[PDB]
Amino acid sequence: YDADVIVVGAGPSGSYAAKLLHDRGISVKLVEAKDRVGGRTWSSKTEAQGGPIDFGGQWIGETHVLLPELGEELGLETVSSIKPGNDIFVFNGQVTVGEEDQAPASASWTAELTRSFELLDEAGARLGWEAPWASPAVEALDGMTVAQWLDENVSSDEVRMIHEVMVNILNGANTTEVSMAYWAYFVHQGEGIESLIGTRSGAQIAWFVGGMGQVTELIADRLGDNLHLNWPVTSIEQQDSGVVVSSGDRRLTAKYVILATPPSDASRMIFDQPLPAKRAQLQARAPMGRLAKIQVRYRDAFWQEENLSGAAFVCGDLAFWVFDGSKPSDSLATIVGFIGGKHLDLWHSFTPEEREARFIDMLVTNIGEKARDTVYYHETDWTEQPWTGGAPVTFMPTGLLSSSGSALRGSAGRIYFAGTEAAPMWSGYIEGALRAGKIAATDIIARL
Amino acid sequence: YDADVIVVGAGPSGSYAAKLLHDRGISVKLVEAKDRVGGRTWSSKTEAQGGPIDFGGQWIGETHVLLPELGEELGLETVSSIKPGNDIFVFNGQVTVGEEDQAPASASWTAELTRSFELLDEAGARLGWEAPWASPAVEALDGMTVAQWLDENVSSDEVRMIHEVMVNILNGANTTEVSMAYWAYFVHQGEGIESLIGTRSGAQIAWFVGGMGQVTELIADRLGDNLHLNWPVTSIEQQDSGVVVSSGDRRLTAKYVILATPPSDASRMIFDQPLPAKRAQLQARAPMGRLAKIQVRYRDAFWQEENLSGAAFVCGDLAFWVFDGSKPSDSLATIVGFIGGKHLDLWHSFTPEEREARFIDMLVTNIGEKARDTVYYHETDWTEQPWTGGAPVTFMPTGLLSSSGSALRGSAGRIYFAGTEAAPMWSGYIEGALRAGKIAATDIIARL
Ligand SMILES: Cc1cc2nc3c(=O)[nH]c(=O)nc-3n(C[C@H](O)[C@H](O)[C@H](O)COP(=O)(O)OP(=O)(O)OC[C@H]3O[C@@H](n4cnc5c(N)ncnc54)[C@H](O)[C@@H]3O)c2cc1C
Ligand SMILES: Cc1cc2nc3c(=O)[nH]c(=O)nc-3n(C[C@H](O)[C@H](O)[C@H](O)COP(=O)(O)OP(=O)(O)OC[C@H]3O[C@@H](n4cnc5c(N)ncnc54)[C@H](O)[C@@H]3O)c2cc1C
After folding, report:
1. Residue A240 lies in a domain
2. Of the bound ligands, which one is closest to the alpha carbon of residue A228?
3. Which keywords does UniProt give here (chains A, B) (predicted)?
């Protein structure tokens, strides 16, 4: 054998699984398709004026345990993402100012928003994170779309617009595309909707100074020539005695394989023998969402003069989730905008010059005319990255979670499923990637 | 350049495009991932006792033009598939005998079945075959499943069960999985439901003696070393003056490429530069169905003694579409059964021996105790074939046809989309594969 274990994919999940194996002195190879590690995490200390920038995922949550622990182990510093001032809600170009991070008690829609979150959380609780595919509630929820559930359960146009931007960003998909069962499950296993839409709480509370890309890069440094970049896995062969992992004519042999890729990217690989039917259907039918991350930098955080946090739920035909991404040690202030799903479909119909003009028009509504005085502007389109299907997460259409969801976790013979989609909680997030890597590495260390 | 054109995929569509280019004197290479040509067509003259057998698609339709013309050009003989006698309808093990190929006027559900076919045909005509993604009716139908359409349009259990077997076989997918827009479009562009479910009419009227695999095999012979087998395309690079098609380290260069694969199988390839957004989303999100084709042979066609055609709609938890697949030149009689979608998910939970036992028990209901005296039994599971996503066809979940469906046809720069899914009519069928290949080859001939 070339190694005891081959890990396929050097995102946070595969990188962490390889780190845990290498730390125990188990022989491991980490193979990665791209010319870099990080997967959906990606940062540069030098490419953007004003300081490090994260092109992919960057927020650390308040309940995350493995991510801050690994940050400490790799010698990274965290900084708070929390901003003072009022968040805003924008509906078709019209601004409602929040009260800190709360919808204003005076708005007609605030009471129904709270009710709509309890309904969504209740649907999630009926499925659970442990075995949603086996829930007596899953058949009915998995035969309908989020759009259909919203038609049945939400009256207020404002409440419906907030739910639409949340799904189009948090799943990168239209409410007409995503199973309500998958959405309800996804939100519950992220500790509920208020957790995932936190602007200063829940999933969004901190950053690593120097960028999130450092997590995988500092692991790659520990692994040395056990990491192979530019090594796209084309086929995986299971034998009685081990596994053969191929990239074209290049072959590596091992006792076990950890597949640390999204199900949709695993579908590109040829398996002999064929994977279990539920897993093969999961890989073919659970696509990635679509998201773009747009970042603008300014000489200073001028919105703080108006007691604006910079955080905004921008709803309508071109919907965004907007944050202040500034670190105290940066040289410039940063606004980060996300656009996904059906809103990104419209964005894709525009020229690059039209997109930048529309983005800056949107910011002028949120933070005023100083938003035109940009020092830097950048878009990362996560539908155009090779061997990454999309962003931020995998989603499922009707019928899949209830028929095939159990194949998100565990193993098939000598192939162990990692990647964030395999995590029992925090699937979709870096914390889930680490949890899924830890489970696969832990189970293989017991088999060795 | 290695050739003017590289054609990717040696199913009927690619094979036919390569043939048309070669016949016009245009230099062409045909590259195929598998160790054989044919794709979803696949036959053997010698592997099965009693005569040639088709593991993949085999029926020729009464309106098909290119397919009978090509068979004639390649020197193949056609024979009628039409069988005399009564078809049957089976509901959870209870037989209703038809009147030839008709539901009996005396059955409580026959009038409702005819009404339901008119409602389905009327939904498809609102979308049309030319540009269903542009129909005013498409967004509403594309946001709901076939199962939800059935809940609104169909009352009787028997009628609902017939529609469920039709979708699970003709799209290889559950009614809760398939967009009603997609299904309605698919059926319309196949000349309507009665055309696609014909047992002795419409899409099912003839066969090629010797097997449908002979079409691609005889084209392969004509192409000689212009065909490369075991040549899975891993990347396609578009340049100013041509394209580079790669299989690992192996490279071919041409002026133009014909992609003659299903969208889902095209998603495996890495494109530099990235395809148009609609096309990239289509390839990622239009999966293939799941189908198995089960064939049993007997000393004679004993069901004819009971004035049974051998054709049956077997409905319920384990649903099949059954035919007499006997040719006069065969030395045994053949029964052919299809199982797909959610019925095939249940079948997959059984062992190979449980499946054979259950299939023979099912045939005993349809044609009596002599069905136990098998001479030959074979299953082709079209979810276990490398570089074919499934069978019989590509399907779409909610949201896709209305957002991205236009990307089924045409071209992106020097890359021309073929494969049956690109056909303006008879998409899903061999006739469609030939039509799409003809359109791609004709447009490239004009460009050169
Ligand atoms: C714009 C954006 C914003 C996000 N925001 C956050 C956030 O703030 N906080 C958070 O926690 N999460 C966030 N996420 C999600 C987070 O990035 C992912 O959950 C996490 O990266 C998943 O890690 P992973 O290792 O499971 O998969 P990935 O990061 O997707 O890594 C998979 C790896 O597998 C490789 N691979 C694929 N196919 C092959 C093959 N055939 N051979 C070999 N290698 C292959 C890929 O190239 C890739 O490197 C965000 C994502 C994006 C893109
Ligand atoms: C069980 C079954 C029953 C059917 N019944 C009928 C019927 O009776 N009549 C009928 O008209 N239709 C029928 N069909 C459908 C019919 O078989 C298909 O419509 C037809 O074969 C489509 O032809 P195609 O060339 O578009 O695609 P395919 O036949 O799918 O061929 C695509 C080819 O591309 C190759 N390929 C994929 N990826 C790559 C890559 N990366 N590099 C290189 N090559 C690649 C594949 O290996 C394959 O050979 C049936 C299908 C099945 C499976």
Report:
1. yes
2. 1
3. FAD, Flavoprotein, Nucleotide-binding
- Residue B287: cis peptide before it, omega within 30 degrees of 0: no
Q: Residue A249 is nearest to which of B249, B290, B397, comparing CB atoms? A: B249
Residues A246, A233 contacting (CB under 8 angstroms) = yes
Based on the domain organization, do A301 and A355 belong to the same domain? yes
Give the 3-state secondary structure of chain A.
CCCCEEEECCCHHHHHHHHHHHHCCCCEEEECCCCCCCCCCCEECCCCCCCCEECCCCCECCCCCHHHHHHHHCCCCEEECCCCCEEEEEECCEEEECECCECCCCCCCHHHHHHHHHHHHHHHHHHCCCCHHHCCCHHHHHCCEHHHHHHHHCCCHHHHHHHHHHHHHHCCCCCCCCEHHHHHHHHHCCCCHHHHCCCCCCCCCEEECCCCCHHHHHHHHHHHHHEECCCCCCEEEECCCCEEEEECCEEEEECEEEECCCHHHHCCCEEECCCCHHHHHHHHHCCECCEEEEEEEECCCHHHHHCEEEEEEEECCCCEEEEECCCCCCCCEEEEEEEEHHHHHHHHCCCHHHHHHHHHHHHHHHHCHHHHCCCEEEEEECCCCCCCCCCCCECCCCCHHHHHHHHHCCEECCEEECCHHHCCCCCCCHHHHHHHHHHHHHHHHHHC
B301, B153: one domain: no
Residue range of the domain that includes A123:
109-196
The contact set of A with B (CB < 8 A) is: 142-145, 147-148, 173-174, 176-177, 232, 234, 247-249, 264, 267-268, 270, 272, 274, 277, 280-281, 284-285, 287-288, 290, 342, 345, 348, 383-384, 386-387, 389-390, 397-400, 403
Same domain, yes or no, for A311 and A207? yes
What resolution in angstrom units was achieved for this structure? 1.5
CA gap A193, A176 in Å, rounded: 19
Which of B176, B347, B403 to mutate against chain A (most A CBs within 10 Å)? Answer: B176
A9 lines ligand 1 (CB under 6 A): yes
Give the CATH number of the domain where residue A251 resides.
3.50.50.60
- The answer to whether residue B162 is domain-embedded is yes
Residue A336 within a domain: yes
Collapsing DSSP states into helix, strand and coil, what is residue B6? strand
Question: Quick one: B52 and B142 in the same domain?
Answer: no
Q: Is the residue at A93 inside a domain?
A: no
Distance CA A218, CA A34 (A): 17
